[PDB]
Design a protein around this ligand. Structure first.
Ligand SMILES: CCCCCCCC/C=C\CCCCCCCC(=O)O[C@H](COC(=O)CCCCCCCCCCCCCCC)COP(=O)([O-])OCC[N+](C)(C)C
Ligand SMILES: CCCCCCCC/C=C\CCCCCCCC(=O)O[C@H](COC(=O)CCCCCCCCCCCCCCC)COP(=O)(O)OCCN
Ligand SMILES: CCCCCCCC/C=C\CCCCCCCC(=O)O[C@H](COC(=O)CCCCCCCCCCCCCCC)COP(=O)(O)OCCN
Ligand SMILES: CCCCCCCC/C=C\CCCCCCCC(=O)O[C@H](COC(=O)CCCCCCCCCCCCCCC)COP(=O)(O)OCCN
Ligand SMILES: C=C(C)[C@]12C[C@@H](C)[C@@]34O[C@](Cc5ccccc5)(O[C@@H]1[C@@H]3C=C(COC(=O)Cc1ccc(O)c(OC)c1)C[C@]1(O)C(=O)C(C)=C[C@@H]41)O2
Lengths: 525, 121, 87
């Protein structure tokens, strides 16, 4: 268990003993066997080669792989399925010192893989989770490793056939490049964009992980090419839907009991069409919301943190299904659900303000102040409201005649809309005035200005990063639009081209997807 | 901030005027009566009976919390940032506005420039 | 268009090749001709002298202007009208 399979070879490798590791395999020890346990704590991989690679010993890994007695298996995996390349990503921590180390080790092991086994390529393999090393880095938040992988070029002609970025030419400050995107967009198992966008938001760098070289241009290309007009068509159709729904709700029949007979006039025929369209849009939104949860199946812990704008479009349709249920049940209450679905719909146009760079932070602020600032302030305020309300209604039993009425009358004190009258006589009126004066000072002055100062901090903290927030919300929209229609992706021609630019050591010409990009830097001459 | 606030005003106003069809008797009157809630000059009365009065109170309480408390203090905190950002550079702003005035005054009258002797010599 | 008028002289100037630029005019090449195009991207001026001046080569500009075979025209401009000083 704890020491299952671990030998003096592992200790020597961890101890930086070149002689001990050499003698271990010189005697005849086999490195293929791997040690696993609960401690295996620090996860450096089970294969000894993975441990040596992760422990800053390139000489040791070279010796193990070149060992004539028993060369190490480069593509071995543990029971779970992590490979050596996966282990390298698993140990990155985004720090400047660590990034250079891990990138260097990754590059060296990759070059060794090509030199030893040109026929096989080791980067394509996937673990049990099924995500390739770049995908694993993207999902796990390792911006440094992802940046290294996405844009790396090997100038050695023999080792230049496994690079991602085939530089096309450089002409002064500008350095035209030709990236791969061979598994960034439209890769079956997973895409590097999908894992970045569909993250728990606990992943640290997702906001700043879309500034990487190919991803920025790739997303700004999909937006400019075809998505920016699909989004505006969607916004315009939602505007038409809300106008029709508002018109049909405003002009609803008022005398009678539902359902209503169809009067043979144009004014009442238009209203039935409006009702039909409003309900049909309430089924489209229902099915879209259901489909979202089936595919994503988000954790109930983080249901509102990451899918706040998908819960609201689902609720705005639940309120209308609940009204078409009560409208055919001969219940007049269908209106109490319809107008809630009406106020839901209009304020849901703040979802479409993420298609505008400057206008897209008000939606983010409203969302973040309702979940963080305003939600955990309701247990602090409610003890005050219910304590000074029970106290006030008990004192004057002998407006403040009920618990509901007293709660309402003291809530208006909190928001400065209440009147300290004291006109009506009460028994114990010197302690009633003291109670109300304490309540107003505590809630209106002291406690309501604490919320106003805590929401100000939130606004200040998420108004500096407007560029960061905007681009991720745009990437999510691009992903959703692309995935919505299959023929859209099929005819999108997302990759810049499908070109043959090099030949593998096997002697067969290789053609792959790629996308030319450009950048400008002349400071280095 | 007028596209953010107007969706709220027109959504909670159509909702409020549709609910109580059976002050809040017109779209103009409801828009006005809810605007005063945003700026803290409105009264939550509920004295006049309405059908569905437990959802009318909920609607108005949601509107006041969203607009008066949450959403109006966002504007007040965003204008504070602007004031803070352009109150540090007062020297920079002043001199350019003075240069524009000088240019306009000089160009206004030809004889003014002719007899100005602008160059030292 | 893209390569309208650009010669090995321009590439050598951009490459910091003193021998190539010297030999270009030694053979008899004329620097008065200018290369223009959509790429001309990074706008360093059309005149080769402007390019050399903008590319951190004072020796090259001095050689081009002093060149006995064909001294460069200091006050030349492109079609638009930008001069070397404007560049
Ligand atoms: C007809 C074509 C409708 C398809 C467009 C579409 O999906 O837009 C959609 C409107 O869809 C509707 O709800 C409108 C349906 C009824 C329209 C009748 C009025 C026409 C006169 C636009 O909205 P969306 O971007 O699908 O989703 C926005 C909300 N989530 C789900 C992204 C969070
Ligand atoms: C007024 C607020 C009304 C409804 C908001 C309900 C959503 C609250 C939790 C969402 C954010 C969240 O999970 O925060 C993360 C975790 O916090 C929580 O789990 C808080 C749970 C409180 C539940 C009410 C951080
Ligand atoms: C700061 C507080 C300023 C307000 C003090 C005056 C309160 C009104 C008041 O005195 O009402 C009169 C008497 O009421 C009282 O006795 C209340 C006096 C207690 C005030 C102390 C409360 C301060 C709490 C904050 C800490 C009404 O009855 P009458 O006029 O005697 O006949
Ligand atoms: C914080 C909110 C404090 C105010 C709660 C009391 C509302 C006034 C109230 O209950 O009015 C009475 C009943 O009204 C209601 O049923 C409304 C209760 C729903 C309150 C929840 C709204 C909170 C929204 C913020 C999120 C008037 O009719 P009656 O006295 O039963 O005859
Ligand atoms: C799903 C949740 C959390 C929610 C559903 C409804 C009941 C909601 O009250 C809340 C809690 C609340 C209620 C009253 C005052 C403050 C907060 O917030 C929203 C929700 C809060 C708002 C909406 O304000 C917004 O945040 C719009 C918005 C912002 C960002 C978005 O990405 C977005 O996408 C749709 C929408 C108004 C209501 O939706 C509305 O129109 C009515 C009448 C009730 C509001 O519950």
């Amino acid at each position: 268990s704890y020491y299952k399979g671990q030998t003096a070879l592992h200790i020597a490798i961890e101890r930086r003993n070149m002689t001990l590791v050499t003698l271990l395999v010189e005697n005849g020890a086999d490195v293929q066997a791997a040690a696993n346990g609960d401690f295996f704590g620090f996860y450096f991989g089970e294969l000894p080669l993975s441990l040596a690679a992760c422990t800053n010993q390139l000489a040791i890994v070279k010796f193990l792989l070149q060992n004539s007695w028993q060369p190490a298996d480069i593509s071995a995996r543990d029971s779970v399925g992590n490979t050596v390349l996966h282990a390298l990503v698993e140990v990155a921590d985004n720090t400047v010192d660590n990034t250079k180390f891990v990138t260097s080790m990754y590059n060296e092991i990759l070059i060794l893989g090509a030199k030893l086994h040109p026929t096989l390529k080791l980067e394509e393999i996937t673990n049990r989770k099924g995500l390739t090393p770049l995908a694993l880095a993207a999902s796990s938040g390792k911006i440094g490793v992802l940046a290294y992988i996405l844009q790396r070029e090997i100038h050695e002609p023999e080792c230049r056939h496994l690079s991602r970025k085939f530089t096309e030419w450089a002409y002064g400050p500008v350095h035209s490049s030709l990236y791969d995107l061979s598994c960034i967009d439209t890769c079956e198992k997973n895409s590097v964009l999908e894992v970045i966008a569909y993250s728990s938001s606990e992943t640290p760098n997702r906001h700043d992980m879309l500034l990487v070289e190919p991803l920025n241009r790739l997303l700004q290309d999909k937006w400019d090419r075809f998505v920016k007009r699909i989004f505006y068509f969607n916004f315009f159709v939602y505007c038409l839907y809300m106008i029709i729904f508002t018109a049909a709700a405003y002009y609803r029949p008022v005398e009678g009991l539902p359902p209503y007979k169809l009067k043979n006039t144009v004014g009442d025929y238009f209203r039935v069409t409006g009702e039909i369209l409003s309900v049909s849009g309430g089924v489209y939104f229902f099915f879209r919301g259901i489909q979202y949860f089936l595919q994503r199946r988000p954790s109930l812990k983080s249901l509102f943190v990451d899918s706040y704008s998908e819960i609201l479009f689902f609720v705005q349709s639940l309120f209308m299904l609940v009204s078409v249920v009560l409208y055919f049940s001969q219940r007049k209450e269908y209106v109490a659900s319809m107008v809630f679905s009406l106020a839901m719909g209009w304020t849901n146009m703040l979802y479409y303000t993420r298609g505008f760079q400057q206008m897209g932070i008000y939606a983010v602020m409203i969302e973040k102040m309702i979940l963080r600032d305003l939600c955990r302030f309701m247990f602090v305020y409610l003890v005050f409201l219910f304590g000074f309300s029970t106290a006030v209604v008990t004192l004057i039993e002998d407006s403040y005649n009920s618990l509901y009425s007293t709660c309402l009358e003291l809530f208006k004190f909190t928001i400065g809309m209440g009147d300290l009258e004291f006109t009506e006589n009460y028994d114990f009126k010197a302690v009633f005035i003291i109670l109300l004066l304490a309540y107003v000072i505590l809630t209106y002055i002291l406690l309501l200005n604490m919320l106003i100062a805590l929401m100000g901090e939130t606004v200040n903290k998420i108004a500096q990063e407007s560029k960061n927030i905007w681009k991720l919300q745009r990437a999510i929209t691009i992903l959703d639009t692309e995935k919505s229609f299959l023929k859209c992706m099929r005819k999108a021609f997302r990759s810049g081209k499908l070109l043959q630019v090099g030949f593998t050591p096997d002697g067969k010409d290789d053609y792959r997807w790629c996308f030319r990009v450009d950048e400008v830097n002349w400071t280095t001459w």
